[PDB]
Structures are given as structure tokens and as C-alpha cells.
Amino acid sequence: DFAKLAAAQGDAIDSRYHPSAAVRRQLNKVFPTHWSFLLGEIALYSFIILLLTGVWLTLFFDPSMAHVTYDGVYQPLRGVQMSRAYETALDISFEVRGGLFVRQVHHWAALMFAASIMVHLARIFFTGAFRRPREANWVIGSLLLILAMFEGFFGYSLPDDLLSGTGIRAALSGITMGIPVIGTWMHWALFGGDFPGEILIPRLYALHILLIPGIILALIGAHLALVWFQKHTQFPGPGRTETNVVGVRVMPVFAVKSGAFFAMITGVLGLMGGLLTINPIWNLGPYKPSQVSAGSQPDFYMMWTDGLIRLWPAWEFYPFGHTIPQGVWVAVGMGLVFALLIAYPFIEKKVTGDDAHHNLLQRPRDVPVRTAIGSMAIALYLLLTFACMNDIIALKFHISLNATTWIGRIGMVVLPAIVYFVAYRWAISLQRSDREVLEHGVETGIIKRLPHGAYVELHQPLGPVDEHGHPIPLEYAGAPLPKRMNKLGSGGAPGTGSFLFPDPAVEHEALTEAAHASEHKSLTALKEHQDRIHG
Amino acid sequence: DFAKLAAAQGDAIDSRYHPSAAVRRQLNKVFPTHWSFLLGEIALYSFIILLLTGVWLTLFFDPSMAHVTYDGVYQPLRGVQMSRAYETALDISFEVRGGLFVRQVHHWAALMFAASIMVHLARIFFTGAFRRPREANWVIGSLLLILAMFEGFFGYSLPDDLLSGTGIRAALSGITMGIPVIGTWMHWALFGGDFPGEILIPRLYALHILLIPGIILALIGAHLALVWFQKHTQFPGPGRTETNVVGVRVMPVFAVKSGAFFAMITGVLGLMGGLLTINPIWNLGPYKPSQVSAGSQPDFYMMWTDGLIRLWPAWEFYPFGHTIPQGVWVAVGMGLVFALLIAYPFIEKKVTGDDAHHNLLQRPRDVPVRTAIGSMAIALYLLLTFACMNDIIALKFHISLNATTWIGRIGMVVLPAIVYFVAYRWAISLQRSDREVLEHGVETGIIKRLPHGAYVELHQPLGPVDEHGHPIPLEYAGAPLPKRMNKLGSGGAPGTGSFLFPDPAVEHEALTEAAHASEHKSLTALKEHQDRIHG
Ligand SMILES: CC(C)=CCC/C(C)=C/CC/C(C)=C/CC/C(C)=C/CC/C(C)=C/CC/C(C)=C/CC/C(C)=C/CC/C(C)=C/CC/C(C)=C/CC1=C(C)C(=O)c2ccccc2C1=O
Ligand SMILES: CC(C)=CCC/C(C)=C/CC/C(C)=C/CC/C(C)=C/CC/C(C)=C\CC/C(C)=C/CC/C(C)=C/CC/C(C)=C/CC/C(C)=C/CC1=C(C)C(=O)c2ccccc2C1=O
Ligand SMILES: CC(C)=CCC/C(C)=C\CC/C(C)=C/CC/C(C)=C/CC/C(C)=C/CC/C(C)=C/CC/C(C)=C/CC/C(C)=C/CC/C(C)=C\CC1=C(C)C(=O)c2ccccc2C1=O
Ligand SMILES: CCCCCCCC/C=C\CCCCCCCC(=O)OC[C@H](COP(=O)(O)OCCN)OC(=O)CCCCCCCCCCCCCCC
């Protein structure tokens, strides 16, 4: 008797505790059903997959520089001096069933985690989901993005490898040791001495399995709690105002679709862990200071820092008996990037002057300057990311390496400006398109007027029509407009039988009539709620 | 203008978010001010200190069996093959400033964590805090205790040492291989091979710094949330009923005293880490299968399992072509111990019939059978612990080793019975003493009657006095009774000046009658509330 068991367990729960009111509040909480609001959920799900795979990896990984001859199963690396970290990473890859798959899906989950954090940041920045409220949420999210970047940096550096060890030698050692006043002191305190210090990988292992992931988990908890109790903002729409949340309740629809999205995201990650090879450490021999490859790139999230290193024009300063290497330039650049990213909402509010409590998002077109600035920043980030890849770009796409380097150098001041101007004008022209649609109706097929040979597009007004043909122009309301009769009630009722065969006419008529009635009911409910709110 | 800054920050917080009602609820939450309710806080604080010191330790610890010659500073161990784990533990001890202190305070915090968990378990069990509302809390707390025990095991097993290594060899390896159908398979899965498998310490390091601490943190969060929302139970008292919490609010008093208690617990643990030497691994050479020591004990929280191993009388069964060693006996014993501990509240309610919502604690004297059973269990646990220590007990206290082993064997069935009987009768006699006080008043000095030579103790009634000398007996209300006029309004007004010199008589009188007024005001307020609840 499952129903009896469920009722008895509910009574027991509500007797031991009294969670009825709180649980009802959680279930009734309304969440907007916009697709762009699942971008953060992508990052959350990738983080969960990262945790689950990381536990499995920690069950088999041994962090240490203690030198060992492989004497394992991978023949091409046998009798070669390697660290225990590399040896156990190879053991995971080869001598543990499914270990290669687990580590590959872990690395793919890391890449998706970074990418989805970046996409979520784009969404919130361009839709203005940070101003007045949620500004602290944006701040902690920026901290979270930085932590994710460095977490992946320590992760793919964890198995002592030629590629990743070269990346460590470049960034962690050179940049740290070039910093003027305390650079060498930070280097020696991180590495327990010179660069190959015997504690680097154990320290990174601690940082990467417990310390940084613990902070990421705490900040994700704060992030989700803030989103939960500072009700999710929504785009302007029919019944959507600054003092309501139009969407679907947590229990029936939102919960099921979020769980299904989690399932699909982990399916994509597993498919890619299987079908696509990520970080073949067996190909990448053990780290040796004397050995190196030509690629020498970090993961795509640190690729912009690496590209900054490559592009910056070798400017070094030599004060009285001292040196200020080019590493400090990139270090200060990263510091500025992170400071600006963290402090943007406060910078934006100081500049514009808007401290009003904003709960309705604004379409990126409706804010030309901010969308222009975001496009400029994304252009700079892409420029740096491809500058880091200039080696392979030059190799495959036949362009001289010096040409790629100088293309990056010139573009990082030219391309951001070009993209800013183009994005600003593009946003304003999207606004102009919205206004033309508002004042003339949607466009359709052309008709030749009866008496004379006039051609008229035969528009379709979106609002009340004046006594004569032309309609009364509507006022923009911050919400998307239908620019194709395609997406309106025009040519959208195919025979509802099947792909191969029809259904009985009675069933088809019943189905289509019921669907039309449901559409009428939904639109009327939205219209009446909107009228009640604004009247 | 700190006041203005605080006001502006509060307004900004209440504008961005709306935490006014929730924060007021948290601040106004009332917590009973009984000392025994700080026992769980002791464990929580020791856990926090454990986290803080463990992060520092992981910054310097390298888990690996990779063999290395020390070549450090510690002269007595130079050129000796040791695992990198032992080498880095020695490096923490000697070659890191304060690393010895940090690891010692970490181990002392582990011991205090186990001890305070045990004391808190005793408190709740004997006071009946596990009844209907909080059996789930009891269950998760039992899981927490088990996790704490095993994490301490893995923690003092992390630095591969002679003592910890032989303890691992005995408990983990032997008792795992002993298990009949899957013992050897479990051993091979855990160690990745034979006992000295080269993944054991990395696996334990992961389990100990990330996995088990994560589960313990989640369970402590659930525990504290349950205590917070299922308002803390309280002992019977003047104004205390099953539907109220008499105590102090969170903000002014409880928060301050809890923070101060955490400070003092940290101070005790730091003082111990300084003055008392805990696990001096340097005296203990690196683990070798051949080297041994006479002591060979685990930490006190696993000493009971080790004592079970020692005492259980070598009963092995040999099915058709197989063996069932004596280790499986102890494995089943531990299983039974944990099962009974976790399932006691449900066992208690099945036995007694209590399905009532209990919010008033029971005095251990007021619940004899449960008090007797708890005393019997504590006696068994102490017998097992001292049986594990029987080696050192025999060495120092001159008792034959065989004599101690057989004392343990006989007493593990005799001492539990003796302690059960004694505790049951002791509880009933405490009840009898309480009723004697209720019916005769508190006892005082003797007086010789005027006409004849009778001697009367000159009692002091605690309630209304009959028309004649003898008082009207009061009804027992589950609250402690004052058996000394010491603790009542008698002999409690020393000169309030100072230790060496007096104060002006006007000041002394003002202070003393102010205190008298305050204490009688408190008594009257409690009395009025008690009368108001029913009257
Ligand atoms: C399994 C099992 C319990 C087997 C029996 C072995 C055993 C514990 C026998 C009892 C030990 C005793 C009390 C020996 C003294 C001789 C004796 C038996 C006298 C008769 C006992 C009796 C009924 C006396 C009447 C009055 C009475 C109650 C006297 C008790 C006297 C004592 C010793 C009280 C304290 C109890 C106690 C600490 C016993 C030893 C237990 C342990 C584990 C001590 C651990 C310990 C040791 C071993 C150190 O060397 C040490 C060195 C430096 C700093 C700290 C320590 C430390 O903590
Ligand atoms: C970026 C932004 C919105 C900024 C707001 C303004 C602001 C506050 C700036 C503060 C700091 C400064 C100085 C920033 C300038 C440079 C900068 C952004 C530095 C930090 C870099 C960083 C940590 C994060 C930037 C993240 C971001 C939003 C990236 C664009 C990602 C998005 C939304 C892409 C569109 C979504 C989508 C369908 C993508 C798939 C289509 C493809 C393939 C797009 C192109 C593409 C991309 C985007 C790669 O990242 C990439 C990496 C490695 C190999 C190849 C590719 C590649 O082909
Ligand atoms: C060789 C080898 C080892 C292979 C394995 C690889 C490995 C190591 C690990 C991966 C293996 C596993 C275990 C994969 C599956 C992971 C997993 C749990 C998937 C669940 C998805 C699934 C099976 C769905 C079935 C379809 C179905 C009926 C769905 C509806 C019922 C379900 C499952 C609902 C789940 C709801 C859900 C995702 C809860 C997540 C809980 C968390 C952390 C947060 C909740 C939460 C969410 C989700 C928000 O979006 C949100 C947005 C704004 C503010 C707050 C929140 C918030 O608090
Ligand atoms: C990849 C790209 C790089 C990354 C890009 C992200 C960084 C933030 C982006 C842009 C910041 C500069 C914005 C433009 C600032 C406008 C200047 C001005 O002239 O002030 C006019 C305003 C309007 O006032 P109004 O009553 O509307 O009158 C209309 C008059 N025509 O005045 C004010 O309130 C504000 C005056 C002071 C503003 C100070 C803002 C900067 C604070 C320091 C942070 C560092 C900035 C880094 C810059 C890159």
C-alpha cells in the first residue's frame, strides 16, 4: 500500500518536525521558464558531475613528486623516471577499469563548468541581472568564476605531466617570481623552495580536492540561496512586473524539468568523455625541465591569461639594481580584469546613477552601452584566447607565427573598439526594428493594389487598428516582438495524425479544437491578470 | 560615524534582501541554559578546530608509500627507508615552524572530538533527548560518532608510522580478510592488492581530508539544523513545560556565551597541544612488517574495538575446506554495537510503548532502567578500553598479562551485570532521596528539644507548612531538589567590598538589597508564568 505508506510517512514527518508551511512555500515558489535561466543550472550540474568523478579519481590518485620508474602496462613509457602523480594518473588511465573514462568525463565536466559559468556570466551581464539587488550575488559569482578557473588550473596540473608541468613552470613559477617586492618570497612559500620543490603537487592536491572545492561549494550554496530567497528576476512580458514572478511552480513542472536537464547534461558529458579524447597524459610524457612541446597551452579558461602573456610586448623595467620582468604586467592585467569584473555592478551604478530595485531584466538591445561594453570585453577575451592558440593557428592555418602574434597585439586595442562600435549600432538597430514592427505590424507577402500597380507588403498589425488601414502604433514594453506571422496563429495546424498515417477526422478535430481553446484560455488568463495588475 | 555606518548597512541589507523577520526569529530563539547542553557544542568546536588545523596540515603533508631515505634534520632517523608520508610527517614535526604544534593540537582536537561526542551521547541517552521528536537526530548523531571514530583511525594512520601501521595491519587487513564470503575481496579492493599495496595511504588521505569530513560536515549541518528548528529540549522546571522553551535569547546572552565557550575550548586544546606530547611519531620508526612494539594500541575511541579483539576467546570455525577466523567475531560484534546504538530509540519505544511527543527531558534517576542500561553499556565500553590497554596496565600496575586478559574476559559479562544492578538501585535510591526531601524538607543542624532530650534535625520545608510543625508534602515535578540549605537563601551574603579590603557600608547595602530585589523579581516572574500556564 504505497499510498498508505506515503500518508503515514508524511504524518510522521509533520509530527516529528513541522515542515508543512516551509515545504509548501518551496513547492509553490514560482520560477520563470526562460531558457537563458538554465545556463546557471548547467554550471551547477557540471559541478555536481565534477564532484562525483573527483571522488572516484581521489580513490586512485597518488600526489607526489617521488620519482619512480613506471614498470606498469603502458609500454611506450617503461623504465622512464616519473613522479608518483604521473604514475598513478597513468594507472587510472590504463590499469583501472573505466578510469580513463572517469578522468576524461571529469576533465570534460571541468571544461563545461568553465564554459557554462562564462555563458551564465554573459547572460546576467547582458540582461542586467546584477543591478541594485543581486549585485552581491554577482560579486560572489565572479569570485566563483575565478575559483573555478584556478581550480581547473590546479586540476589539469595535478597529474605531473609534460604539458601541464610546462604550464606550471611558465605561469605559477615565472609570474610569481617576477613580482617586484615579494615575488620570490611568494614563489618559495608556494613551492617550499625552488620550482621543482617536492611539495608542489601535494599542496595543489589539497587545494584542488578540499580547499578550493570547499570554497566553491560554500559560494554555490550562498549563490543558490540568494537566487532562491531573492526571487529570480524575469524578462518583461504580459503579466510580468517588478513585484511578481510569472512562471511555473517548483513541484510539478520546474523540478521535473530541472532534473531532466541535469540528466541530459550529464548524458552530454558522458557521451563526450567516451567519444572525444581529453588530455592524453600517456602521450604527454612525464614532466622534465629539459623537455617541452610546441603546443604548451592551458585549458580554454586560462587561455586568455596565457594569450595576455604572449601578446604583451616584452616591456621590462630595471630600477636601481633590480628587475621588473614582463610577468608583472600580465599579473597586474589579471588583477585589473578580476577587479573590474567583480566591481562592475557598482561601477555601472556609479556611472549611470540607477540604484532602483530592478526585478525586470532588460533585453541586451535595450541597453546599447552595456551590451556594447560586454561585446567589447568578449571580443578582447576571444582575441586573447586565440592568441594563446596562435601556435596551432599558425601551424594549421598557414599564417606566420610573428604575424599571428602581431595580429593579436594590434587587435587587442583595435578589435575591442571595432566590436564596441558594431555592437552599439547593432543594439540600436535592433531597437529600431522593434519600433518599426510596433508601428507598422509584422511583415508578410506582397500584394499588388487593385486600381494601380502599387506594391504593399500587406503587414499585420499587432494592436488595435485605426478606422482606416494603418494601425494605432503600440508603445515598446521591453519584451520581444513577433517579427514573423510564422510564430503567430498563421499556418500552424498540420494534420495531427502521425508521421506516416492520419488519424480519424473526429479525433483530429477534437485535438485541434482543444488546443485552440487552451491557447485562448492561456492568453485570456495572461491578459486578465495584466489588466488587473495595471488596473 | 560607526552608528551611521551600521544603520546604513542595515538599511542596504534590508533593501537588497528582506532578512528582518528571519533574523529577528533567529535572534529571539530561546535556548535552555543548562550546562549539559554545551556538551554538543564542545564536539562542534573541536570539529571546527580540526578543520582549521587539518587545512594547515594538508598544506605540508604528502601521502605516498614511495620509499625514500630521510636525509632530513632528525638525526636518529637518517638514511632509513621510509614512506614519503612518514617523511613529510617528520617534516611537519621538525622542518616547518610550528608544524609540530599544529599536528599536536590537531590530534588533541581529534581526541577531544571523540571524547565530547561520547559525553554528548551519554547526556542525550541518559536524559531521554532521543524520544519521539528527535529519534532521527539520535540516528544521524550515531552515524556521526561512527564516522568520527573511523576518521580518527584514518587520521592517525595517515603518517605511515610503526604504531599506526601495525594497528592498520591488525584491524583493517586482518579483520577484512577474516570476513567469510567477501573478506579477501574487500581487502584487495581497499588496498588495491596485498596489505602493503601502494595506494592505501593516498586512499586514506582522500577519505580523511575530503570524503569523511564532507559527510561529517553535512551530517553536522543536519544535526544543528534539526536542533535549531526542533527547539532544544529542556529539563522539567518552574516555568518549563512540554510546549515552551525557558532560557535565554540567541542574541544577547547565548551567542556571547557560546562564542566565549568556543574560545575557551580552543584555549584548552592549544594548551594541550603545547604542554602534552601527542603521537610522537619520530620515536616511532617508519612502518616495517617486521618491526613491532609492545604497546600497539589505537586511539581511545577505537581502544574498545581493539579490546574486543583481545578479549574475545579465539573461537574459530572451519567449514568445509574454509576458515572463519576470530576477526569475524569482532566484526560482527562491532556491527551489533553500531546497529543497537543507532536503533536504540526505536528499540526503547518498542519496549516501553512511548509514542508521545516528549519535549521535557527525563532525569537519569527518574528513568532507572534506561539509566541502568546506559551504565551497563558504559561499563562494558570501559572494560573493553582497559582490556585494550591491558598490556600497559599489566606492565605498570604489576598484574600478569594473562590475568588482565582473563579479568577482561570474565568482567565483560560480570561487570556489566554488576553495574546494571548497582545503577538501577542507585537511581531508585536517588528517587527515594528526592521524595524524602519533598516530604520532610531540607536537612540542617540538630537541636535538642526543650522539655525532654529528643534530638530533631530541624528540617526546612520546601512548601506550605501545615498548622502544626510537619509540612504538607509537595508533588515531585521532575526537577532537582535543593538538599542543602547552602544553595537556598541561607548564608550567602559576604561583605561585598573586595578580597583584601571592604567597601563603604552604603555601597554594600545598596548592592546587597539590589541583588535581593533582582533575585526575588526573577523568582516572582517565574512563579507568575508557571501559575499563568495553568491557572
Ligand atoms: C581488562 C582489565 C580492566 C583488566 C584488569 C587490569 C586492571 C585495570 C587492574 C586494576 C589496576 C589497579 C587499580 C592497580 C593497583 C593495585 C590494585 C588492583 C589495588 C586494588 C584495587 C581497588 C579495588 C582499590 C580500592 C581503592 C581504589 C578504587 C583504588 C584505584 C587506584 C587507581 C589506579 C585509580 C586510577 C585508575 C587508573 C588510572 C588505572 C590505570 C588505567 C590507565 C589506562 C592508565 C593509563 C596511563 C599509563 C598506563 C601511564 O603509564 C601514564 C604515564 C604518564 C602519564 C599518564 C599515564 C596514563 O594515563
Ligand atoms: C565578458 C563580459 C560579458 C564582460 C562584461 C564587461 C566586464 C565587467 C569586464 C571586466 C573585466 C575585463 C577587463 C574583461 C575583458 C576580457 C575578459 C572578458 C577577461 C576575463 C575572461 C573571463 C574569465 C570570462 C569571459 C567569459 C565570456 C562571457 C565568454 C564568451 C562566452 C559566450 C557567451 C559565447 C557564446 C555562447 C555559445 C553558443 C558559444 C559556442 C559558440 C562558439 C564556439 C563561440 C566561440 C569560442 C569561445 C567563446 C571560446 O571561449 C573558445 C575557447 C577555446 C577554443 C575555442 C573557443 C571558441 O571558438
Ligand atoms: C565509469 C563511471 C565511474 C561512470 C560514472 C561517472 C561518475 C563518476 C559520476 C556520474 C554518475 C551519475 C551518478 C550520474 C547521474 C547524476 C544524477 C544524480 C542525475 C540526476 C538526473 C536524473 C536521473 C533525472 C531522471 C528524470 C526525472 C524523473 C527527473 C525529476 C526527479 C529528479 C531526479 C529531480 C532532481 C532535481 C535536482 C537536479 C536537484 C539538485 C539539488 C541541488 C544541488 C540544487 C537544487 C537547485 C536547482 C537544481 C536549481 O536549478 C536552482 C536554481 C535557482 C536557485 C536555487 C536552485 C536549487 O537549489
Ligand atoms: C574591455 C573593456 C574594459 C572593461 C570594461 C568594464 C569597466 C566599466 C566600463 C566602463 C566604465 C566607463 C564608463 C564611462 C564613464 C563616463 C565618464 C563621464 O564623463 O561621466 C558621465 C557620467 C554620466 O553622468 P550624466 O548625468 O548621465 O551626464 C551625461 C554627460 N554626457 O557621470 C557619472 O555619473 C560618472 C562619472 C565617473 C564614472 C567613473 C567610472 C569608472 C570608475 C573607475 C573604474 C575603472 C574604469 C575602467 C575603464 C575601462
Ligand code: HEM
Ligand atoms: C570544482 C570544480 C573542479 C574543476 C574545474 C576540476 C577540474 C579538474 C581537471 C580539468 C582535472 C584534470 C583531469 C585530467 O587531466 O584527466 C582534474 C583532476 C582531478 N580532480 Fe578536479 N576539478 C574540480 C573539482 C574536483 C573535486 C571536488 C575533486 C574531489 C572530490 C577533484 C579531484 C580531482 C583529482 C583527484 C584529479 C586528478 C585526476 C588525474 O590526475 O587524472 N576535483 N580536476
Ligand code: HEM
Ligand atoms: C573531522 C574530524 C577529524 C578527526 C577526528 C581527525 C583526526 C586526525 C588525527 C588523530 C590525526 C593524527 C595526527 C598526528 O598523528 O599527528 C590526523 C592527521 C591528519 N589530519 Fe585529520 N582529523 C579530522 C579532520 C581532518 C580534516 C578536515 C583535515 C583536512 C582539512 C585533516 C587533515 C589531516 C592530515 C593531513 C593529517 C596528517 C598529518 C600528520 O600526519 O601529522 N583532518 N587526523
